[PDB]
Each structure stands twice: as C-alpha cells, then as structure tokens.
Design an enzyme around this catalytic site. Structure first.
Site, PDB file in Angstrom:
ATOM      1  CD1 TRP B 130      92.761  66.547  53.059  1.00 16.89           C
ATOM      2  CD2 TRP B 130      93.194  68.423  51.955  1.00 16.89           C
ATOM      3  NE1 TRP B 130      92.571  66.287  51.743  1.00 16.89           N
ATOM      4  CE2 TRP B 130      92.821  67.425  51.029  1.00 16.89           C
ATOM      5  CE3 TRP B 130      93.503  69.687  51.489  1.00 16.89           C
ATOM      6  CZ2 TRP B 130      92.757  67.658  49.660  1.00 16.89           C
ATOM      7  CZ3 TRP B 130      93.449  69.920  50.150  1.00 16.89           C
ATOM      8  CH2 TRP B 130      93.075  68.917  49.238  1.00 16.89           C
ATOM      9  CG  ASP B 211      89.970  73.779  52.883  1.00 20.34           C
ATOM     10  OD1 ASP B 211      88.923  73.701  52.212  1.00 20.34           O
ATOM     11  OD2 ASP B 211      90.908  72.985  52.750  1.00 20.34           O
ATOM     12  CE  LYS B 246      85.687  66.246  50.266  1.00 19.62           C
ATOM     13  NZ  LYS B 246      86.720  66.864  51.058  1.00 19.62           N
TER      14      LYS B 246
END
Ligand SMILES: *Cc1c(COP(=O)(O)O)cnc(C)c1O
Ligand SMILES: *Cc1c(COP(=O)(O)O)cnc(C)c1O
EC number: 2.6.1.1
Lengths: 396, 396
Positions: B130, B211, B246
């Site tokens: 990311w 993460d 999400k």
C-alpha cells in the site's frame, strides 16, 4: 521492546473525567472538562442536530470516502462563519479549509504542515493556555515559548506584559491566539487591543494561528469573530483551527476545520496541497457524520434558525450561572471577592484557587475543578450551586 | 511564509478519484480505489448499518466526549474479531485497543507511539505494498526499508526471496505484515508460511505490526486472521492496525483500531498509557458515529447475522467478477494468460499492466486503474465487463 516504557501522566483535563468516574461519593460535582450541561445536569444532543441526523439517515445512500479535505459545503460554510459573507478572502479565493477530526485535529495538521513546509521553529502560546497546545506543537517538533497574558492580581489582561513578552518573538514565528473565550482565563482582548495586535504581527512578521473553539459563546457568532477579522483584513497569511464541538454540542463526532489563507489563490492552492499530504499521512480523510450535520444545519434556513436559538440558550444560561455563582459565593460567606468572574466570557472562570485548595475540594468534597483552579460554570446548575459554594468557602 | 512551498504530488490512489471525477467522457470506468461496488455500480450503505444507525438516532442522548481510547465494547468486540473469544491474550488481559480514525489513523498512532517510547528506528514493509505505508511511517520519523514479496514472473509469493530479505533486519526492527488480502498483489501466505514467519520473527526479535484491513474478504472472518493468530500465540508483543472501512462499508466514518499486545497486563497498561498520550496530541478522542455502528452490530445477534450475510455477499460478488474478468478477457482475445487473477484474493488484482498501458487505458478509453497496474475487481460489473476487457485487450 515495551518493558522499559514509563507510564504517562494522566491528562490534567481528560484525566479528571476518569477520577470523577471511579469516585462513588453520592453528591460529587464535575466542574472539570469544557462540556456544556443544562439545568438538569445533562449534555443533550441539540434539536437542530437530531433533526439533521434524521435527514441524513433518510437521504444518505453511500458511505464512500470523503476527500482528503472533506465536504466542500462544510469548508465553504465555515469560511463564511469565520470571515463573513461576501468577504475579501472568500471572493479572492485566498482561503482553503480542510475538515479535520475536531479542532485538536486542525491544530495538529496545522503543526505538521508548518513543521514540514516552512522554516518555522517555534510557536508562542499564551500564559496560561489550554494545556494541550503544548503537547500537539511539541509532537510536530515545534518549540513553544510563552507570552504573558493574564494578570492574576487584578484578573485582567496585562496588555503591556503581553506586548513586551512578544517582543522576543522573531519574524517568522507562529503566535497562537484564542479567537474569543480565552481558555482558561475567559479574558479576551477588546477590538482596539485586537487591531493593535493585528498591526504588530504585520510589522514584526509573525504568522498568526487562531484557535477558534468557542465561536458564539461570548457575545455572538459575528461579534466573536471581530478579532480574527480585524486580523484577516491585514494579514497576507493566516491559519485558523476552529472546532464545532462546543457550539454544535457535537463533542464526540469530531468536527473542526483547518483554514489556510495565503496572499493569493495560486499560493494558497499550492500551500494547501502539502496540508492535504500531511492529512493523508495522518488519518487519511475526515469522519463524515458530524461535518455532514453541521453542513445540513448551516445550509438550511430553518434548521439554522433553530440552532442559533439553541446556541443562544447555552450562552445565556452560562451567563446566568456566572452571576448566580458570585452571589451565592457572597451569600455563603466567601472571604475574598469573586466578582471578576462576571467579567470573564465562556464556559470558564479562572477561580484563583490554589492547587491545594482545588485538591482539597476534590478530596474532601467530591468537587472536581482542574489543578489551575479553572472551573466550568456551565457545569453549574441551580441545584448544585449551594453545595458547591460551601465546599469552596470551607477551603479558603 | 508560504511563497516557497512546493506543490505536492497527487496521491497515487486518492488523486485518481479526482482525475476521474473530471473527464466528462460518458462510459468512463473507475477501477482505482478500494471501495466496493455492487452489480448496479455503487457503494450502498449496508442494511445492518442503516438499522444500527436508526437505533442510534432513537437511542442517543448525548454527544459528550468519548475517552481517548474510544468505546470499550468496540475495543472489546475488535479483540475477539482479531484473537478469538477464548484466546489467551484476552483472558490474560494482555491487549489494549484504542478506537481510531480508520486503519490509517491506527497505523499512524502506532508509529507515533513506537517512535517516541521505543528505540525503533526503521520498519519493513513489503514490495510492493500500500503506497501510503511509506508516507505514514516516514511522518512519525521512522525509516522504511523493503522486503521481497511478489514474484512478478510466476505471480506468487517468492517465499525464500522474502525470507532472505528479512534476514537483513535486526532485532528490534518493525516488520509490517498484511493480515490477509495483500494490497496490491492479493497474494497471501499460507498458514504453514505464516508459522514459519512467526517462529523466525520470534527468533530474530522483530516486533510484528499487522495491517488488517480486509478481515473477511478472503475466505471468512475467522479464517482470515489465522496468520495473525499464529503470531499472537508465539509473541510477547505485537501491534495491530485494523480497519472496518471496507468490511462494514463505513469508509467515510473512519473506523478502525490500534491493538497493543504486551507480555502482561501491567506492561501493556503502562505501554498503552503513552499510546493514549500520542492520540491526545493528535486528534484528542475518536469520532463516535461509526464505531457506535460497528459496536451495535457486533453486539446484536440479529444485526450481526444480517451484516455477516452482507459481507459474504460482497466477497462472493467479487469472486464472481474475477472469474468473469479472466474469461471475457480470454473471450476478447487477450494475447496473455491472466489465469493467476483467479488465484489472488480481496478487492484487487495486480494486472501486470505496464505504467504506459494503464496510462494509455485511461487517456484513450476512460478506464481508470492505479499506475502500478492495480485494478479493483470489485468495480467491475457484468455491464462494464465487456467494454473494459476490450480496453485492456487493446493496449497490450
Ligand atoms: C475545546 C478546545 C479545543 C479542542 O476542541 P475539540 O474539537 O474538542 O478537539 C482546542 N482549543 C480550545 C481553546 C478549546 O476550547
Ligand atoms: C484500506 C487499507 C488501509 C486503510 O484502512 P482505512 O480505514 O481506509 O484507513 C490500510 N491498509 C490497507 C492494506 C488497506 O487496504
């Protein structure tokens, strides 16, 4: 890796909310945190807010990410609140507003911004000042020196001392001002004193940063912005960190804004692209809910008339608790004279109570004030006014 | 002061959203940014969320500040999502969770905490990873180095190349892992590979930092955390920045958590106190709306059952779009083999498209993909599947 980490000292403000909680004394009184309470001791969700919320529940169809800078109408509506309608900074397109998580979040993003895109080395925060200013600026890497403010003997603004102490300030330094309702003192400069201060930061070359957190609580929405305005008129560059926490009763939703004004559109646009990069590096984008609410209320004529009314009730109710406090204080035996409290604006008065007197109030009487002796007047109600003034008098 | 500020480059993901929301071509296709889209092309507010939201409107009486660490049951419900109901880190009071503005807000506070209360100096993030990992860590003060990951030739996890690269990291270094749904490759380690990395990490004294932003988009809620649970069993300390953006479609409400685990509670207590200090200096306390929504849903048996059904619908519609994509691609005569796309999981696919194909693809066909060739398979629809596969097939 964590074995030698030492325990952090509790927040002088946010730490009280904790003790008060674990405290079981039945008649305990909370005069700590700067949250409004009504006649019944509750922090109600404003009506205009519940209405705006209904509206959102009905009309929202997506949670899709907002942009680094948030809701456009939010920014647009906050600059008219800050600067005025049909204002030079707005027509010239000199300003840009990013929506942030509360005014603390605005403060920090402004800190990380400056630390990183300017030659800024230090910031001046008043003495005394909100305890957390020191902590956000040091976190970004900035040194914070202090300028004189409060005259504790006459409980007034020591203008000279303020002015003379600020002379050690270099061209290029940040000087932090409180838009209105000085936290913790509640003593604000007058308009002439503001203009005087507007003219000096221009000749001395400082970059003003306004912590605007109580717009509406002193005199009125517009009146409260005179100072900031007297400044925006003369400054080429400015930073405004404003909060909607207190004036919209929106505390835990985290609504604030960081307004960046520059000399012109292209510069401010350019400056602003770095601020967005810092926000992206921090929390990514802002929380939609509270900001949508504020936006809904400010962009609808009805919801807005209601909100203005509610704010006016909060302000005025606080002004009644100020005058009731000194009275009951003089009715109840008060050794000293606390009438200067009436001349202070906002949720707080700087009591002039000693750290041992505040420690005693808390300990012996469950009355919770902050170590500096800053008491939340809006936390006072006609039902707790008597037990309060007796605790304070038994400790003088 | 601002005259010399250089303009910052647009975010490689978030800026894309603007270039898109700007070309007035009719059939333009946004395949860049990780928001879920349903069969009709939008990111609807989940129904379990609208329900929890109604409950909040009816049921909230105050907007009073949450605690620096947020809502307790939120923290408590997150830990069971992560570790497992039962799980020793929970019963031994080994973890503390702070509610944070999104997974990006988590990552940042863990960075700010690590950099100011530990001797961590650098963090290892995979290649690729990311794009914002690098900007977050660097903002805190940390250096970020990279470890091997993706084998772009065979489209797999290059295990020994990752393991050989990590052998250059010292004891006391932070190695960041992705819980499941590697962003942007979608290639994830196996449980065996997770154990190996767990044991090796324990031996080299690394501090693992997970993460977890897609719990549930791979195989399921519980099975997506296996890797994470494998490290927790062996480690004394680890941190988890998890997002609910999400998987609850709460993208703009900013909901996530920073979970700190230490050898024991006294330690984690002490450690956490500084993590709260880093938060207070940043945003002060978290936004209530979305974490109140997640909490309501996870707490309620009905709402949780519905929300879980919604998640498995999204997950499955995505797995439908990835098979439909490689088939229609294979049907429009794509020179290449794209069969690996089926092998990857989560919202994305690492297309293998060159920087210039993806640039051609957009100027020329209105098809928006991230410069790295990262395509959001969840932005694909059976309506837009035909025109998009013809755009791709025409630039290769
Ligand atoms: C309340 C206040 C802040 C903090 O506002 P939040 O939105 O709660 O983070 C900052 N500065 C001053 C002067 C305040 O009164
Ligand atoms: C989306 C994402 C994040 C961010 O979660 P947010 O709540 O959106 O900040 C972090 N890491 C990865 C891999 C992500 O996909």
């Amino acid at each position: 890796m964590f074995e030698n980490i030492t325990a952090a000292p509790a927040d002088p403000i946010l730490g009280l909310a904790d003790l008060f909680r674990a405290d079981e004394r039945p008649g305990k009184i909370n005069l700590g945190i700067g949250v409004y309470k009504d006649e019944t001791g509750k922090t109600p969700v404003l009506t205009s807010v519940k209405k705006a919320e209904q509206y959102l529940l009905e009309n929202e169809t997506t949670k899709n990410y907002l942009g680094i800078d948030g809701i456009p109408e939010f920014g647009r509506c906050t600059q008219e609140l800050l600067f005025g309608k049909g204002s030079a900074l707005i027509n010239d397109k000199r300003a840009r507003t990013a929506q942030t998580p509360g005014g603390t979040g605005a403060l920090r993003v402004a800190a990380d911004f400056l630390a990183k895109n300017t030659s800024v080395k230090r910031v001046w925060v008043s003495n005394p000042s909100w305890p957390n200013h020191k902590s956000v600026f040091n976190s970004a890497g900035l040194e914070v020196r202090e300028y004189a403010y409060y005259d504790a003997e006459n409980h007034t603004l020591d203008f000279d001392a303020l002015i003379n102490s600020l002379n050690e300030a270099q061209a290029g330094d940040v000087v932090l001002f409180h838009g209105c309702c000085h936290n913790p003192t509640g003593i604000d400069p007058t308009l002439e004193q503001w203009q005087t201060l507007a003219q000096l930061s221009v000749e001395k070359g400082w970059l003003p940063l306004f912590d605007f957190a109580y717009q509406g609580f002193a005199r009125g929405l517009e009146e409260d912005a005179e100072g900031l305005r007297a400044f925006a008129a003369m400054h080429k560059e400015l930073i405004v960190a404003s909060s909607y926490s207190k004036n919209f009763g929106l505390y835990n939703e985290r609504v604030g804004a960081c307004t960046l004004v520059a000399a012109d559109s292209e510069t401010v646009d350019r400056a602003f692209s770095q601020m967005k990069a810092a926000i992206r590096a921090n929390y990514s984008n802002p929380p939609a809910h509270g900001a949508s609410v504020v936006a809904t209320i400010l962009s609808n004529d009805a919801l807005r008339a209601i909100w203005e009314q509610e704010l006016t009730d909060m302000r005025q109710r606080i002004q009644r608790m100020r005058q009731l406090f000194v009275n009951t204080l003089q009715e109840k035996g008060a050794n000293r004279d606390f009438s200067f409290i009436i001349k202070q604006n906002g949720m707080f008065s700087f009591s002039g109570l000693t750290k041992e007197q505040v420690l005693r109030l808390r300990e012996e009487f469950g009355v919770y004030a902050v170590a500096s002796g800053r008491v939340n007047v809006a936390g006072m109600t006609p039902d707790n006014m008597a037990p309060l003034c007796e605790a304070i008098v038994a400790v003088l």
